[PDB]
Ligand SMILES: Nc1ncnc2c1ncn2[C@@H]1O[C@H](COP(=O)(O)OP(=O)(O)OP(=O)(O)O)[C@@H](O)[C@H]1O
Ligand SMILES: Nc1ncnc2c1ncn2[C@@H]1O[C@H](COP(=O)(O)OP(=O)(O)O)[C@@H](O)[C@H]1O
């Protein structure tokens with residue numbers, strides 16, 4: 001035993017350096033956290049929109065004070081999780097971005113979402129069991145047996161429409177299935193996509209279908225589609241257009257470029273001849289079912 | 304006075320909105336509970 | 352013996368590990384001790400040059416300013432027209448900048464992963480090569496048009512009934528370029544602001560001049576197109592302004608080269624004839640209802656991945672198929688499996704096709720039957 | 727009918743200063759940029775030369791009906 005005292009003396013010197021090492025970084029946290037809570041106590045965050053992310057690394061944003069800003073240094077958020085078109089919470093004076101704010105959802109879109117579960121059951125609906133059956137299997141089974149449609153292998157049906165006399169029960173099935181399935185039910189009014197300013201109803205379409213894109217179990221309802229679904233017409237000197245704008249993004253945003261099978265559409269009208277046949281094609285609205293008048297027995301059943 | 308866009312989970316960290324100007328992450332006072340600061344609501348907000 | 356040496360060094364290595372790890376954790380936060388000190392560089396633009404030091408700018412905010420620069424930053428390179436960076440406090444130009452990309456167009460550029468091919472489409476191959484003639488042939492071989500002495504066309508459009516493959520064709524084109532195919536939904540280009548609907552048509556095509564071989568696709572132009580008006584409502588004023596920006600930007604005072612425009616509509620009746628001019632829209636591609644052979648084609652296209660039994664007389668389906676679309680055959684092939692979904696038949700029997708055509712056939716009794724001939 | 731083409735030919739064979747503006751760009755988002763954008767063009771035509779202004783799509787600006795509510 002000769003060198004164990006020298007190497008043990010060196011190891012004891014290394015632990016004696018470890019004491020001032022843990023004390024060194026443990027002293028190093030205070031002065032950096034003191035300015036970290038200084039830039040975090042600036043909690044009023046002037047949010048912006050990420051215009052562009054440079055490569056000569058840098059970025060340009062625009063605050064919602066309509067003010068553009070170049071910056072050389074990004075900040076606490078790195079460049080990799082960012083992209084042009086985002087929206088972040090930014091320091092006021094430095095104009096230095098700090099956080100990542102998630103979404104851009106309108107309050108009217110938040111009003112569209114139910115949280116009530118209006119309880120209805122199918123034996124409260126007598127004498128419509130064919131339309132009830134083909135309605136339920138067209139929506140519920142692409143939400144519970146997906147490998148059954150993939151077993152044979154087909155794209156599942158997409159878009160159902162109900163039409164008929166306005167007293168035959170059309171809201172009733174929607175509130176029924178809204179009580180049945182435990183998904184993100186989302187309802188719409190007819191002239192709800194009608195705005196004074198231009199483009200607001202169209203952005204209201206893409207925001208709602210962005211939210212229904214987000215909730216992957218989700219189905220969308222439309223009541224009284226003919227308020228917006230008026231057939232177009234060629235007219236000089238006059239004629240509305242703005243409703244047909246939102247109708248056209250309802251067409252394209254519904255079906256066409258970049259489709260998906262995540263939402264199912266339930267549309268309710270009473271009159272058909274007003275409607276533009278562009279939504280009546282085959283695939284935008286697949287299953288067009290009418291609700292006739294009760295024969296005798298369903299009249300006994302309702303009362 | 305302003306208008307609330309939304310809150311977030313785990314934290315107050317409110318998202319506010321005003322008439323023309325930009326949008327901020329804002330906070331309560333000590334005088335009120337976070338209960339009736341529900342989303343889509345007008346609130347009186349100090350200038351500083 | 353050095354046996355107690357290696358027993359001693361085990362506290363020395365982990366002793367220095369408490370230095371290295373927590374010191375690196377203090378270093379990563381030590382970057383933010385000074386990294387949070389950058390101040391903005393207000394995005395401006397050079398108007399002209401007065402003297403070597405007297406420059407003149409205007410922000411994206413408001414008023415026009417007189418400004419100086421740094422003495423090391425290539426003042427000769429400050430051309431009237433460039434996008435530069437400023438100072439907030441003393442108002443001096445700090446750094447020249449490249450052009451902007453206005454991220455609606457960046458989020459118009461390359462967000463389609465649709466990898467559909469020409470094998471999927473079928474029945475309109477004359478229109479396939481016809482549409483190929485403008486976007487693929489002179490982009491690879493200009494010398495024949497140069498020797499003949501005529502310029503290749505600027506743009507062409509697609510019209511017909513809904514569900515004939517007008518979107519599907521442009522998606523088949525979209526699986527070829529991946530960098531310079533800009534697709535337009537004709538509804539994102541409008542907002543409630545003053546000229547921002549026109550700024551988009553400015554800078555989409557500025558980006559089109561930035562990337563020289565490029566394709567602009569225009570889906571459902573009837574929202575923005577219009578014929579004209581005698582000025583009824585207050586909304587269509589600035590939309591006519593937005594359209595007349597587009598018409599001058601097509602072939603007004605510009606060599607419109609290598610930027611090919613493909614359009615599509617369901618009704619070419621609500622359009623401006625000035626937009627329908629053969630100077631601007633050069634070819635009008637008519638896509639009609641399929642014949643019996645083309646319905647046989649699309650039927651065999653959508654009839655591919657279907658578990659069936661080999662007794663399918665495809666002739667009878669086509670024989671009851673009269674006036675059908677390109678998508679309702681996919682509705683029939685979809686809905687024969689909607690007969691197979693009851694009684695738990697994993698296969699598909701031949702009968703459910705004729706049931707399916709007898710349901711799809713009278714399902715479209717409520718159609719409007721318009722042909723929409725362009726004028 | 728050669729509306730743009732004739733201005734191209736005159737603008738090609740001209741000897742005076744030619745100023746070529748696009749008559750749907752005076753609608754800026756900001757106030758005043760439009761009117762100042764109107765006046766400095768004619769100021770540059772004044773100071774520059776015995777010059778020629780060209781304006782296309784006048785229907786983008788000069789219409790008939792108006793509305794002091796937007
Ligand atoms: N004959 C056919 N054979 C195979 N598939 C077809 C046929 N016709 C249509 N389809 C399919 O059905 C869909 C509807 O056709 P298409 O995409 O041309 O309509 P569209 O012009 O996009 O409609 P809109 O532009 O009005 O939204 C297409 O995506 C296409 O794949
Ligand atoms: N099984 C049923 N058949 C027919 N009508 C019913 C049935 N059950 C309830 N109703 C009544 O019919 C109405 C159905 O609404 P609905 O006809 O969709 O209204 P509208 O179509 O006019 O908007 C309900 O208000 C309800 O009171």
Ligand SMILES: [Mg+2]
Nearest residue numbers: 170171223268
């Ligand atoms: Mg109803």
Ligand SMILES: [Mg+2]
Nearest residue numbers: 603729730731
């Ligand atoms: Mg012209």
